Every structure is written in structure tokens, then in C-alpha cells.
Ligand binder design. Structure first.
Ligand SMILES: CCCCCCCCCCCCCCC(=O)OC[C@H](COP(=O)(O)OCC[N+](C)(C)C)OC(=O)CCCCCCCCC
Ligand SMILES: CCCCCCCCCCCCCCC(=O)OC[C@H](COP(=O)(O)OCC[N+](C)(C)C)OC(=O)CCCCCCCCC
Ligand SMILES: [Fe+3]
Ligand SMILES: [Fe+3]
Lengths: 309, 309
């Protein structure tokens, strides 16, 4: 029993897609037509039954009901896949991406407090918080320190929860989220705490599909970065805290060579005093290099729905 | 950019699909692998940008957020495609389906009160409801009246809402929903009102997408049926009220030849008195013929999530 490649189904696909329809958006029709064709065929090829089909439909409802589509997306490799395509294009244009890009993740929040050169991003509400001095230099496309660059950083606390997405509703707005404008020396410096890794909500749809694939839904500890500056393309990346069990086994496949950074521990009272800290602290250094706009155009910025508070 | 056919992407797809993992469900992985492959390839062939991709992801959260996955499904023709497969299968098996099947729709509710032979389906809460006397005979696979058959019926009121899915939340439990056991003659008879067609929620995700395809989200007036009986397969079908502007332009493509029925208008005082009505009423007669089980089993019953009350 095969009917996909019969005139009836083929003409039906054009109808359902609004192809012969006058109004509408041709780009959407084009994509829908292709998607539907593939799904109708996959249904026949894999002999998907109605029982299976409807199970799939129910999954989509609960996926959206839990607002987890942006979480399952990276878990199924789409996010990394899109970065791969962007790298391939940059390679085509002859652009050398000094600091490699990686996925943004679905937890960015716009509207964080902004300051120049330095900033403390945690509010101390975290008990297990281990002080972390993260700092580096921002280089323009010519390798020269770039003053006035906007560095945006966001990460989870020791429980693996981000502010605005903390189920305990324990965090104040923008905790561990800050924008730092680079100083006269193109430097940024922040005092925060070592983030903990985290996984998908165990009861959530993303995690349960993952179970069906025999995969886990964990991410190693990391720190997200957005770096933008005049005449430069917006850099999206993150750094992985070296030593994490899932550094090279992140369910979001975001890890890359050059993004893994070692956290140096300092117990020496001489260090603890230079860096106005109360006691032992970890230190991480990470410089990032930006690329120029391609003819006054940032050909890789992504306009995507992002929570703004 | 062409990287889909590279070993890097191909292996990645197998990893994301968990094909390499030992745990999980092999059937699920098999499907996931195929779907991701097709989508990844589709993203390449159609050069889908990140901006486009993320709009698609946002749309999905939206769809599930409004619980409209089962409404978009029929709109994109899946529901009908599955029926077509079922007909092809029966055809290959030499089963000529006297009463053509059609889609069930996402609005069935299990638990309706049942009675033998007769029942009034509505509670008269509809101001503009027009009385309808609906009746017919259920015939077995041999063409003989089938007493004890279970006829399940559900439909909307004049505003196009079904009980349990009324936005204006205005209906008595199971209003216009009933189960009837055919009498000593395989007959069923109900008193209710003529349903009005209905469209998808105007501001909902299903309608938003249909607009992009230049299509409407309307269904002609219709009445849903479920007919089951020992020794026979469960029949899912419906009847279309003849004369509806959308009779042959249903956005869910459920209309089939032989399911369009004429509602006969009675106004003469004798018809009014015979049928214990209190004024002019419409009458529709519809007989259904069931098919036999295939080697002891119903090879086409569908088990899908259905609201139960
Ligand atoms: C609007 C357009 C709709 C498009 C949807 C089309 C998809 C069609 C493919 C459907 C594939 C689902 C089939 C899988 C299946 O038959 O069952 C899936 C599992 C169930 O677990 P079991 O143990 O097998 O249940 C059974 C327990 N018993 C044995 C005891 C009864 O549940 C799940 O959620 C896994 C399903 C998630 C698949 C999502 C793919 C989307 C990719 C982005
Ligand atoms: C986790 C796995 C997820 C995998 C997802 C795979 C799908 C990826 C392909 C989707 C591509 C989407 C392209 C659609 C698009 O580029 O724009 C779609 C419309 C927007 O209309 P505009 O007028 O352009 O908006 C702008 C108006 N302004 C300019 C005035 C601001 O919005 C919409 O919601 C329509 C989107 C429909 C796509 C849903 C497909 C699902 C069906 C099975
Ligand atoms: Fe993160
Ligand atoms: Fe209906």
C-alpha cells in the first residue's frame, strides 16, 4: 500500500499548501509544501500508524504548552547545525572567526543592568556560591584592544537555574546577568560565582523525548556571551568551565575547541587582597576577537524571540 | 552552502537521533532520525535562515500553548491523508466500505449519556437553535438492520461551538453529545438542532498559518458519527448539511461523496404533530452500513487522546 506518489496525493499537497492560492506568503507556502511532502512520505515509508501519528501530535501540544520548543531545538542539534551553516558561509566569504561562535541557548533576557569596565553580577543570595573573577580583553578585527565594546554575560547559579527561569522564584531580576562596556583598555571584569551545569526539566517534554532516544539532557557548566561593537558583527558564544563531566557530552552540542577555559583557584591572601575578595576565589580569563561587518552589514546576527524585561 | 551530505553532518544526525545509544526506543529513534534528516536537508535546499527557523520554533510553542496541534493537523491535510491510506488498505483487501469514513476531528468527548433508540441531544439553551429530527438505520455487513449497534453523535450549536470546547464557556455537560443503541430494528432517532459550521479561532496559531497560505479556516455545518457493533469495525464518519457554502471547501477536507445530506424543512401542522415537535423543524435521514472485522480484528480503529468527562 503506497499512495504518496499518486496524482491524488500530489495534487492534494499543492492544495493544502495554498500553492494555487492567490493570497498568502509564497515563501511560507514553499516551505510548508516541502515540509508536508516530506512528512507525508515519511509516514508512508516508515509505515507510521494513526496511533503513532496522534501520539506525535499530542507531544507537540505539550511541547508548546511547556514552552520547551527552544529547549528541544538545541537538543536535536538544530542550534549547532545552524552554527555549522554560518561557519561554512563565513568560510566562503573568507572570514576568519578568531573566537568561534556557538549556540545562544533559549535563556537570554534583554534589559540587564549596564556598567563600564567592571560589574558584580550576583547578589550573594546563593549560599554555595564560589566567588569567580571573570575578565578579559575585547579585540577589534585588527587585534587592537577595543574600548566601548558591549559585553553581555548571563549564566546559572550553583543550582543550575537562571534568573527569570528559576522555578524556585528565588532570584531577583537580572541576577547573574550584566552588560559591561569595555574600558579605555578594551577590558571587561566581573565578579560573580562559578555556575553549575544543569539539565532539562526531568518531567518536561524535551527530557522525555530524550529518554526515548536513550540520551540525557545535561549541559556542562558554562557562561554565555554576546559581544557587540560599532563596525563589527555581533559575537555569540560561551565558555565551558574546564573539568566538567559533560564538557564534551553536552546534550546541546555547543562545546568547541577554544571555548573551554580553566578556572584557576586562588587561596593566597596576596591574591585574595589584590582582587577585593573576602577569601578563596576562582579566576577565569577569556579574551574575545570580533570580526568586521561585511560591507557595513552583519550577515549573521539572529533576530529571534527573546524575553525582554 | 552545502554541508548536509558531508560525513560531519551525517554522523551528527545519527548521534542526535540516539542511534548510537544503547538505551531508548528503537522505533522512536528510527522516526526521529528520518524526520531530522529531512528537515536538516530541507533547511539546506530551501536555504532557511536562522531568523526563519526561530520564527518556526516560536510558532510551535504557540501552537502547543493554544492546544491547537489537533486543529492544524486536519488543516494541513494529515487527518484526511490518513483516511486515504485506510481506504487504500481496505481497497487492497477487497473491503468495499458502503458508508465512507472521514476524519474524526479533535472534539470528541467520551462519557456521553446513552439510551436506546431515541434521545433529545440538546438542552434548548440555544436561542436560534432550529429543531432537527435525525434518524436512520444501521445495517450490518450483509445489509440487514442491526439492533444493538452503538451510534455516537456530536455536533455544534448555531454559533459553531461544541460542549466542552465552548470559548464563551456556556454549555451543559455533553450538550449535543449522545450515544444511542439501535432498537429492535437497527434504528436510531434523535431530536437536536441544526449545527452551524465553524472556523478556527481567528487569532489562533492555526488561523495565523492558514492566512500565510491564503486559505480560510472554515468547516461547513456537519454532524459527527461513531458507530460500533460486535463483529464489525468501528466506523468514524460524518454528514454534511447540504447547501452549506463550505460543503466542498472544508479547510479540513473531510467532505466525501455520499456524506452530504439534505435537511428537509417541515412546516405543515401534520408533520409537526406526528413528530412531537412544537413548531417547524428540519428532518435528516441517514443510514450507515458497517464492515466486518478483518480476521477477527478491527484493522483500522484509532486510539488517540480524547477528552473524557
Ligand atoms: C501538526 C503536524 C504534526 C506533525 C507530527 C507528525 C509526527 C509523526 C511521527 C509520530 C511519531 C510518534 C510515534 C512514536 C510512538 O508510537 O510512541 C511514542 C512515545 C511513546 O512511548 P511508548 O512507550 O512507546 O508508549 C507506549 C506504551 N505501551 C506500549 C505500553 C502502550 O511518546 C513520545 O512523545 C515520542 C513522540 C515524539 C515525536 C515528536 C517528533 C517531532 C520532532 C520535532
Ligand atoms: C524543535 C524542532 C522545530 C523544527 C521546526 C522546523 C520548521 C522550520 C521551518 C520554518 C520556517 C519558517 C519561515 C516562516 C517565515 O519566514 O515567516 C512566517 C510567519 C511570518 O509572517 P511575516 O509577515 O513574514 O512576519 C513578519 C512581519 N513584519 C515584517 C512586519 C515584522 O509567521 C508564522 O508563524 C508561520 C510559521 C509557520 C512555520 C510552522 C511550520 C510547522 C508546521 C508543521
Ligand atoms: Fe546556558
Ligand atoms: Fe466538527
Amino acid at each position: 500500500v503506497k499512495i504518496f506518489n499518486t496524482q491524488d496525493v500530489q495534487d492534494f499537497l499543492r492544495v493544502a499548501s495554498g500553492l494555487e492560492q492567490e493570497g498568502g506568503n509564497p515563501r511560507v507556502k514553499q516551505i510548508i509544501h516541502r515540509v508536508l511532502s516530506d512528512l507525508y512520505k515519511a509516514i508512508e515509508d516508515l509505515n507510521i500508524t494513526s496511533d503513532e501519528y496522534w501520539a506525535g501530535v499530542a507531544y507537540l501540544n505539550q511541547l508548546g504548552a511547556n514552552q520547551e520548543a527552544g529547549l528541544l531545538s538545541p537538543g536535536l542539534g538544530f542550534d549547532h547545525y545552524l552554527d555549522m551553516r554560518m561557519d561554512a558561509e563565513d568560510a566562503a566569504l573568507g572570514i576568519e572567526n578568531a573566537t568561534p561562535r556557538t549556540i545562544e541557548g533559549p535563556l537570554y533576557v534583554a534589559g540587564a543592568p549596564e556598567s563600564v569596565g567592571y560589574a558584580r553580577m550576583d547578589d550573594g543570595s546563593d549560599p554555595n556560591g564560589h566567588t569567580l573573577i571573570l575578565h578579559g580583553t575585547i579585540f577589534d578585527a585588527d587585534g587592537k584592544p577595543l574600548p566601548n565594546a558591549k559585553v553581555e554575560i548571563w549564566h546559572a547559579n550553583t543550582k543550575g537555574f537562571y534568573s527569570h527561569f528559576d522555578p524556585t522564584g528565588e532570584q531577583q531580576a537580572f541576577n547573574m546577568r550584566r552588560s559591561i562596556i569595555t574600558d579605555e583598555n578594551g577590558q571587561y571584569r566581573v565578579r560573580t560565582i562559578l555556575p553549575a551545569g544543569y539539565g532539562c526539566p526531568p518531567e518536561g517534554p524535551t527530557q522525555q523525548l530524550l529518554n526515548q532516544l536513550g540520551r540525557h539532557g545535561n549541559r556542562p557548566a558554562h557562561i554565555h556571551y554576546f559581544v557587540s561593537a560599532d563596525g563589527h558583527r555581533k559575537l555569540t558564544t560561551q565558555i565551558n568551565v574546564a573539568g566538567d563531566p559533560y564538557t564534551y557530552d553536552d546534550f546541546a552540542y555547543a562545546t568547541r575547541e577554544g571555548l573551554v577555559v580553566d578556572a584557576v583557584e586562588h587561596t593566597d591572601p596576596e591574591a585574595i587582597k589584590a582582587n577585593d575578595v573576602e577569601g578563596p576565589f576562582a579566576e577565569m580569563v577569556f579574551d574575545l576577537k570580533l570580526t568586521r561587518l561585511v560591507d557595513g552589514v552583519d550577515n549573521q546576527v539572529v533576530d529571534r524571540p527573546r524575553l525582554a524585561v
